Amino acid sequence: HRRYDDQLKQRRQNIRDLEKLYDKTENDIKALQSIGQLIGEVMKELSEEKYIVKASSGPRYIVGVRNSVDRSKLKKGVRVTLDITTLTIMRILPRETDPLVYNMTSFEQGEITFDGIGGLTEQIRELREVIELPLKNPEIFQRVGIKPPKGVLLYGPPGTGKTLLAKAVAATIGANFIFSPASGIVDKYIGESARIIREMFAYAKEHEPCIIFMDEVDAIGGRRFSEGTSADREIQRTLMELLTQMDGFDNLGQTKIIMATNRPDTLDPALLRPGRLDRKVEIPLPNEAGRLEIFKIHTAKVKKTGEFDFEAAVKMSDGFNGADIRNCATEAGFFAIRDDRDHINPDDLMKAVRKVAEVKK
Template sequence: MATVETAKVPVAVHAGGDERRAKAMEEHRRLSVGQIIGEVLKQLDADRFIIKSSNGPRYIVGCRSRLDKTKLVQGTRVALDMTTLTIMRRLPREVDPLVHNMSMEDPGDVSFEGIGGLSDQIRELREVIELPLLNPELFARVGVRAPKGVLLYGPPGTGKTLLARAVAATLDINFLKVVSSAIVDKYIGESARIIREMFAYARDHSPCIIFMDEIDAIGGRRFSEGNSSDREVQRTLMELLNQMDGFDELGQVKLIMATNRPDTLDPALLRPGRLDRKIEIPLPNDQGRLDILKIHSTTLSREGDLDLDAIVKLSDGFNGADLRNVCTEAGMFAIREERDHVVQEDLMKAVRKLGEAKKLETKLEYDKV
């Protein structure tokens, strides 16, 4: 009897191994064959779902036992077996290429220490964006709702985009940079769809910062008159307003908007609850210009000391970008003289040259928003 039993044991084990191997091969065959993309419409019971395939028809199908069925909610994209239409796996949300390109934007190695003359503005911006993301319990303890977004406005070249990049780089979280004019599409409804997908992507990848530059391209004041393109921009604005304070809370998604023309923005966009704080980024004063020059002149190869105070006196009305250009032009003067270092005279020539060019620029007056 013992001989018979010992002969049976290896046979049973061998048969079980063949069965598992066959199941594994069948599973591999199913996963290696092309699959159909579908969308879950409704769950009927514990094992059956109504799905809509990419071809159009709707089916009642089953699901792989290994899948977490609690995640197969309405709207979930799934992969279906070619023959049985069984749900094989859950797929990530479909992302528009334009939204994907927004997420690829790298804020770069920017820090607040590299931004001069804006200490008060930096403090206000960090209170609205950084504090709710890092310490949300502070707002719950006080009993107030955390701000959703901030508007940065002021003349060109004063550092609005640089501030947004510094916030994203400091927090090291997901960052979507949106050029608002690129959202507007010639086809009706496409611009609003991109706005919806952008906010859906940000919610799925929270915490996330959405930076919308040149917001006046889609956030302009609405009028009763206008052509079809104006109405498309208005539809885009209404979708943006809905996403900012609709039924779906933004949660760990924060908005930073920037513009040179705050006077053209729609009042509905500016109201508290959507943009809770408006921060003016003005032209730097004397101390601010000195701080900016110190930052940009640290990389210059120099001979002797540079009198930056003299440059500050000649640079009234210059913005941060102009002051950086002063250092660049000084380097160009040094190269023209076949030198490998910058001297004081190079900076003086550069600031005078840019001062003449600044006379041709149009000045805008900014009222408090």
């Protein structure tokens, strides 16, 4: 009776719990009995039933159609799945020929939104209507009959809120921000250099919308020593590639490319033509009004006492970028651990503001 119930429930609970575990191990063995399957790239499509492949596992092969295969989508250098013995097309994958994870470092959205960095507002405004609108609405530019925009340039010192503006345009679109190190685009092998640029452009269209952000265009571009030969042909090959895709039959539509350069005068005049870079944004030192809006935002997200004075800090600050406001918060905070608190106070604030002023102009 009483005895029988106490076992019955407990035994009912046990059998289910064991059962889920045992089936998982049995599904596992099934998954393992499966056999490998070699990857290649289609070199070019020979017919509708014969294809030429450069294997990514072997020598050169003629391979054929299997069943219900995509027969008009196999193009140069797309990665494909081939059978181990059958040697027919098992699947098509997206094109890949270079890692996507270190030669391309990905930041899905942006670190901050585009109205939380506010006091860079003019630059926010004119990045927003050039970059966001053709990505979201390619249709308005098609309907007018003008070209969607091509390239956009950020220039000025890095961290004037330069980095902010680039991260921030991407967030609002929900683009992926893709940081490319320009030197790594410097492989010393045949066509590696060709390969890398192309693959970013191909990936930009697959994973669309996307920002391809190319940092420094004086390790793959620039005006060089005089543009002779000293090892200035590696640099010349890299720039030539950028120029050929832009000017040519290829184009930029849901691939936006963004150039970054310490000072804009250092860039080849081909890059300075429209049809490479149409948009050229400058990043100056903010306004007093501009400083004011950025400080109120910055100090807001930091907890502080009612007796804090925004008015005093803004008055002391002239020639301050977003970075300089951020330093005043952290500097005060050293004095605030020191004064044995858990919040930032006018006493911490004044000292901090004067020190950050002193160290610079």
